[PDB]
Amino acid sequence: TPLYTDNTANGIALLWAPRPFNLRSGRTRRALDIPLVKNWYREHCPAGQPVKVRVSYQKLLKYYVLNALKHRPPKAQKKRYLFRSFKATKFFQSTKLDWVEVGLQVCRQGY
Amino acid sequence: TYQRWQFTLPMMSTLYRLANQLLTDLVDDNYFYLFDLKAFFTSKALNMAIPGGPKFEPLVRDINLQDEDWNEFNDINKIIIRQPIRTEYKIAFPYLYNNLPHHVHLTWYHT
Amino acid sequence: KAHPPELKKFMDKKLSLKLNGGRHVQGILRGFDPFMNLVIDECVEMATSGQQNNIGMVVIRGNSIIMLEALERV
Amino acid sequence: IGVPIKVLHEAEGHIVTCETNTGEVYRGKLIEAEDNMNCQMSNITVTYRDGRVAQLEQVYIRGSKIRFLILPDMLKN
Amino acid sequence: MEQTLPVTVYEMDFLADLMDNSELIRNVTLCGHLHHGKTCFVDCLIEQTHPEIRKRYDQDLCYTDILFTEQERGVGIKSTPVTVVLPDTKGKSYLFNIMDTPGHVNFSDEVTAGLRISDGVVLFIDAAEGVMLNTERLIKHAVQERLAVTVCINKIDRLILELKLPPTDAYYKLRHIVDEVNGLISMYSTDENLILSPLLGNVCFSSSQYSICFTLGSFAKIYADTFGDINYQEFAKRLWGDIYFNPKTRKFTKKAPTSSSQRSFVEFILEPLYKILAQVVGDVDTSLPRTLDELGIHLTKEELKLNIRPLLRLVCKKFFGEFTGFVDMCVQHIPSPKVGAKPKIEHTYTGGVDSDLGEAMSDCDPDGPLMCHTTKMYSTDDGVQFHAFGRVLSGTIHAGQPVKVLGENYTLEDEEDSQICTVGRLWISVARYHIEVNRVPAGNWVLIEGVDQPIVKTATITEPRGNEEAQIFRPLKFNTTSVIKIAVEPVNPSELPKMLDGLRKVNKSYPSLTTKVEESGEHVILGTGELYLDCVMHDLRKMYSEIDIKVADPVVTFCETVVETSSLKCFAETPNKKNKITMIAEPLEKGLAEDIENEVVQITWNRKKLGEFFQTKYDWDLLAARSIWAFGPDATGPNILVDDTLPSEVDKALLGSVKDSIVQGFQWGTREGPLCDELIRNVKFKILDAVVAQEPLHRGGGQIIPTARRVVYSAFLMATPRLMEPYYFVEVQAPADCVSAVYTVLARRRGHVTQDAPIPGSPLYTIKAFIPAIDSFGFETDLRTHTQGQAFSLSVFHHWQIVPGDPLDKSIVIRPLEPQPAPHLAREFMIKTRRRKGLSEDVSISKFFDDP
RNA sequence: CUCUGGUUUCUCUUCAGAUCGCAUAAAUCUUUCGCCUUUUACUAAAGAUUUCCGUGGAGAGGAACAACUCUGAGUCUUAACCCAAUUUUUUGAGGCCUUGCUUUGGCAAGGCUA
Numbered sequence A: 001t002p003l004y005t006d007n008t009a010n011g012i013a014l015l016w017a018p019r020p021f022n023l024r025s026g027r028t029r030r031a032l033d034i035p036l037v038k039n040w041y042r043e044h045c046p047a048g049q050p051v052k053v054r055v056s057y058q059k060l061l062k063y064y065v066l067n068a069l070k071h072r073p074p075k076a077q078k079k080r081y082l083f084r085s086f087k088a089t090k091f092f093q094s095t096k097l098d099w100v101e102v103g104l105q106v107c108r109q110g111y
Numbered sequence B: 001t002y003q004r005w006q007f008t009l010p011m012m013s014t015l016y017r018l019a020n021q022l023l024t025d026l027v028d029d030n031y032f033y034l035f036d037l038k039a040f041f042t043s044k045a046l047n048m049a050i051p052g053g054p055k056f057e058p059l060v061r062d063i064n065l066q067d068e069d070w071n072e073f074n075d076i077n078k079i080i081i082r083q084p085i086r087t088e089y090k091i092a093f094p095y096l097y098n099n100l101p102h103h104v105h106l107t108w109y110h111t
Numbered sequence C: 001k002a003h004p005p006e007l008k009k010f011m012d013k014k015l016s017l018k019l020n021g022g023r024h025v026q027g028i029l030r031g032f033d034p035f036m037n038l039v040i041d042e043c044v045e046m047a048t049s050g051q052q053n054n055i056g057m058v059v060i061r062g063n064s065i066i067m068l069e070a071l072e073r074v
Numbered sequence D: 001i002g003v004p005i006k007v008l009h010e011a012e013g014h015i016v017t018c019e020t021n022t023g024e025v026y027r028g029k030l031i032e033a034e035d036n037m038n039c040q041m042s043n044i045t046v047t048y049r050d051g052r053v054a055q056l057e058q059v060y061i062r063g064s065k066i067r068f069l070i071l072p073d074m075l076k077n
Numbered sequence E: 001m002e003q004t005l006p007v008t009v010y011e012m013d014f015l016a017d018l019m020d021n022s023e024l025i026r027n028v029t030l031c032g033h034l035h036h037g038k039t040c041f042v043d044c045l046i047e048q049t050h051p052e053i054r055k056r057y058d059q060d061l062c063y064t065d066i067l068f069t070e071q072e073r074g075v076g077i078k079s080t081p082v083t084v085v086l087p088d089t090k091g092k093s094y095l096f097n098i099m100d101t102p103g104h105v106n107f108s109d110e111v112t113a114g115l116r117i118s119d120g121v122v123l124f125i126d127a128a129e130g131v132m133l134n135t136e137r138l139i140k141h142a143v144q145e146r147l148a149v150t151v152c153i154n155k156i157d158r159l160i161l162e163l164k165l166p167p168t169d170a171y172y173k174l175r176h177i178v179d180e181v182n183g184l185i186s187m188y189s190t191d192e193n194l195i196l197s198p199l200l201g202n203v204c205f206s207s208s209q210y211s212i213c214f215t216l217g218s219f220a221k222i223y224a225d226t227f228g229d230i231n232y233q234e235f236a237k238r239l240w241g242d243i244y245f246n247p248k249t250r251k252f253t254k255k256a257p258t259s260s261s262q263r264s265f266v267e268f269i270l271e272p273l274y275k276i277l278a279q280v281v282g283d284v285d286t287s288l289p290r291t292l293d294e295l296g297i298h299l300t301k302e303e304l305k306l307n308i309r310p311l312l313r314l315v316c317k318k319f320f321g322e323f324t325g326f327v328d329m330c331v332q333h334i335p336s337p338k339v340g341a342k343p344k345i346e347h348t349y350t351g352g353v354d355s356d357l358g359e360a361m362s363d364c365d366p367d368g369p370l371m372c373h374t375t376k377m378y379s380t381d382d383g384v385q386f387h388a389f390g391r392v393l394s395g396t397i398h399a400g401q402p403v404k405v406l407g408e409n410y411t412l413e414d415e416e417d418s419q420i421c422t423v424g425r426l427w428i429s430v431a432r433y434h435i436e437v438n439r440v441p442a443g444n445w446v447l448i449e450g451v452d453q454p455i456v457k458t459a460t461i462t463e464p465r466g467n468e469e470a471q472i473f474r475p476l477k478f479n480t481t482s483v484i485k486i487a488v489e490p491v492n493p494s495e496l497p498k499m500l501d502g503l504r505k506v507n508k509s510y511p512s513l514t515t516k517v518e519e520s521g522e523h524v525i526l527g528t529g530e531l532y533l534d535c536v537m538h539d540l541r542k543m544y545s546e547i548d549i550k551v552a553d554p555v556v557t558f559c560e561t562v563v564e565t566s567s568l569k570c571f572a573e574t575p576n577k578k579n580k581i582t583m584i585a586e587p588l589e590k591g592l593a594e595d596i597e598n599e600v601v602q603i604t605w606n607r608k609k610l611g612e613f614f615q616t617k618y619d620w621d622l623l624a625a626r627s628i629w630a631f632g633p634d635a636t637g638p639n640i641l642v643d644d645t646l647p648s649e650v651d652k653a654l655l656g657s658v659k660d661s662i663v664q665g666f667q668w669g670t671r672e673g674p675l676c677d678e679l680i681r682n683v684k685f686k687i688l689d690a691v692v693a694q695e696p697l698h699r700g701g702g703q704i705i706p707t708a709r710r711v712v713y714s715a716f717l718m719a720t721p722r723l724m725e726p727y728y729f730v731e732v733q734a735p736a737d738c739v740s741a742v743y744t745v746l747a748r749r750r751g752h753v754t755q756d757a758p759i760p761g762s763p764l765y766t767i768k769a770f771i772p773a774i775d776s777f778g779f780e781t782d783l784r785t786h787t788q789g790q791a792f793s794l795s796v797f798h799h800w801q802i803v804p805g806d807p808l809d810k811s812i813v814i815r816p817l818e819p820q821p822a823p824h825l826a827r828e829f830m831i832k833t834r835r836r837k838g839l840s841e842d843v844s845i846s847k848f849f850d851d852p
Numbered sequence F: 001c002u003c004u005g006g007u008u009u010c011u012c013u014u015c016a017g018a019u020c021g022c023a024u025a026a027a028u029c030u031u032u033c034g035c036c037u038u039u040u041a042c043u044a045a046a047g048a049u050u051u052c053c054g055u056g057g058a059g060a061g062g063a064a065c066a067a068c069u070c071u072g073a074g075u076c077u078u079a080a081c082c083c084a085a086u087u088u089u090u091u092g093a094g095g096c097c098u099u100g101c102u103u104u105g106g107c108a109a110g111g112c113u114a
């Protein structure tokens, strides 16, 4: 067996890559539930920045801490599904439309 | 349903390389010494601000240092001053530098 | 497997050897092999009469070794 | 390697009794037990076929020429 | 017994059977630097013997570090005992009493407490960091405490997954670590029979996280198991250490064929390990099935579905099995302790080995007098009652049996520091659960209930109506000195009793803690350092006393010395106006105080050897060398008391009559000190004259002792006095870049960098420096926060140094809240510590003189 | 050598203080101090409840294709060729006489042999 292959350093680097790039399986999250810059504003602010952006960093940290501190475990439900009930009803029907078409539709409906 | 996934290591490596521009290339949590949720909780509880950290309203009605009335304990004539006790020292060692540390969190030591 | 008997401790010590046939000899351990065949130096036959006779350096086949006893401290 | 052999090695450091093929009975501390049942013992009491006893400091008996061994009951569990 | 216990591979009945046979026991102490893997190693052993318990995939279980503070901080704070039945490579089973100790340099008292009752030491060394400060100090401590030391090189996976060194360079790194350890051992131990090398079996290689542990013997056993025609003993004898394999002749040689062949170790042990790890972490989806097929490992699809780290742990566990190399090492190179009892009694027992009880205990038989020795005190979760943890050196402890507990002050003449107690229950303490038993024989560790009341730190338990000639074991000698000092007060004075109870409880809990009440009614606590004191305060505020406490800012304890002989010879007279004494003071020579403290000399020595040493080494005339009377506050103190009074002027018989009183006065005076009432260090007190009253009721008692102390004070004050500061020795472990930052931070605080070197085979640097203890406060957090966490430092007390200023100067003016410049730090410290103690505002060199 | 257990998808019932969610909203009530004069804390903290956006597990029903990879189980090394002078399928430990002991029967010792 060869000591190393062409994808050995890659695996060793993946061992230390940050989450979720150190995994090889898992679940699917929501586009809302994935924040891209939380790690950016959890870090020390880069040196030589203006006061406004410095205070922006600090305030984002403040609200992040407040959420983390006030979080409470979710409660026990019975898993009732509004849209499933709607579909069960006779007043609604299923179909596939272009998202922009549906957006115009809902704009008109709200108007 | 698009619920769960299991990728291969070459796929993970390519995705990591592509996402590189959004990741800070940190291998340890030593970066976040006195800059993690526990340190922020302790600062909020003690009503103090880490230089780069957030700043909240006093959790408990703050004790006025001009109220205490010069006992033998707080006699300023016995103190030996070498370096001012910054907020960081109290955040790092809450129970040794503070009086009445309530709802204070111990911060993870070196890794 | 093909193990040695653990006899290094007994090397160059005086020993008392009980052999089959109710035979007994005494001498200094000079070596051994995996079959427990022994080399015994300055060997003496302890005849059933009580009389003892010097036979010199000898080979004892491990097959016919019942028991050995050290006459020294190991 | 046999199950009884493992249990024998377990008795190393304990007081055990050994009968040879010739019926001499040796009681004392088991120092070393080899895979082939070769037995090193110390501070022995030997009881011959005529009934007489003797005392020995150090002995070593070949496995083949052992009929059986009695081990402590400390092991049974 | 019969209480409920978790399922185990072995059985408690077999464990009870084993305890009786003191030949299959092993008392081991796991010690080493901070964060070097000891706790995870112990936990993996517990996992092996207890199938139900397990270490989480993402999080690491400890099964030590049970405390809430330990769990939150991530640093072991208290030593933890474990008792397991581990199987040996040969298939035999032994009983291991393993005391896992903390690593932080501040908690070395726990390590000393473990060593006192241990018989062997296992030193855990990280494979990347290598030798470090605490490893050096622990090697020194072990070889001085006369224990057998073996080594486990842990974290060997950092050479493969972090440094990714080539196999030959990894071998070189391991060899270098072994060489460093051997050098340290040879330095600190005269005997050369203790040499560490994997060939002998004194060194094991472990990766605790991924459950790897092996010795050359165990790996050769794996090879033999795969192919059954080799003696793994010979194979292991040949593997390590510059032995090149030759396959054409299938033989091992000291001469390398082809000038490119790898050593047998690199070829057989290291290289396949590299291969296994690389295949698991790089090719889990392409060739790992083939590699596992070759190795014979078969694992389920659900098992191979895991992530890389759990999969590595699983594959390595399947390949290696149990930690048999550790058991081999401990069994082969640690006393029985039937064998090791004799050195233990020789070193610890105060009555000497030659004593009849000395022999009876060196025998170490379960049937004999009871001579248990208790060194630890563990509190229940409720924090009400303490259980004494100790070892049984003779006899057998029985539940409900009345016993006699002797404290530290007990002596065969003053038999009042003893008390008759009634032991309630006994436990065989596994880390997180205690197996209750009804008796314990000699040669085992035991928890005892009902004997906590009459003991504070250490004690010895014997039987009443027997062992009348029983003497206590020596009190623990600690590896350092507790210097940092804080003052404590309740917030509401109505709750003082609760605070006092908490103070007593923490004093019991922490072996080297010293709590005291000053003259001004101030409750002071002495601790080793910042983290030590923080943990102590957390315990005092949350566990024991449930009240709120104000703490003063930390400060250190100083000493008092002289720099030149007394200006004039001084004297004093007893209130009876007889019994005049006359003394002079001077400074000792360099290093003599160190010799006295480190026991290079012993006042117990015969006067012949004492005078010989003093004459030959420190150029002392034999006349004076044979005139020694006392060695400072303790039997081993850094001050000496001699008498130069020639017999022509005074009666030697009368001086011998008053010798005890004069010595007591001298020791008390040295302990207190005139300047700020603190220890006097490095001073020679010479009695130049003494006129003694004839009648015993005219001399002795309350007449000479206060007069002797007053004369000592007068001589010290007449001699140019100075204060002495404590100095910590700091050792930072920083990246190759942050050395300049470390230099800056140290320079800011009167620090002085002795050295800064790289760590061979690692990308890091070690910077060794000296820092005043008083300025050390907050230094580590300053460094870490300025460097962004990449620099870490540990500090330990090193030595005493003279404070820059001159203390007995009244010209200086001190403002209340200003950092004074260097030249009058001495005066500032003196006056402020005087105020703290509550003494007069200042001292005059004629204060204790009789004339004014 | 054979017998279970499958995968996907839609829906219903119920439990979940597990980061049920590696993310994060709103409403009400209470206390606190704000600042108060009548109404009104976005720019403020604590506690409690509730509602919404989202999960797990288990059970039930439907409908689409795969049916022995794996999970185990029934079924526990089946045999081609060669072998035993320390631990059992090749073992030369074989006999007789005398004496003593023993109620006899029976047991111990020595010698003779080829």
Ligand SMILES: Nc1nc2c(ncn2[C@@H]2O[C@H](COP(=O)(O)OP(=O)(O)OP(=O)(O)O)[C@@H](O)[C@H]2O)c(=O)[nH]1
Pocket (backbone or CB within 6 Å): B111, E033, E034, E035, E036, E037, E038, E039, E040, E041, E060, E062, E074, E075, E076, E077, E101, E102, E103, E104, E154, E155, E156, E157, E158, E206, E207, E208, E209, E210
């Ligand atoms: N890479 C690697 N890390 C390890 C290994 N073993 C332990 N560690 C890590 O080292 C750190 C120290 O863990 P512990 O062993 O529990 O600490 P300790 O040995 O008890 O030392 P103290 O905290 O002073 O008591 C942890 O963060 C572990 O994850 C190992 O084998 N390999």
Ligand SMILES: [Mg+2]
Pocket (backbone or CB within 6 Å): E038, E039, E064, E065, E075, E076, E100, E101, E102, E103
């Ligand atoms: Mg630990």
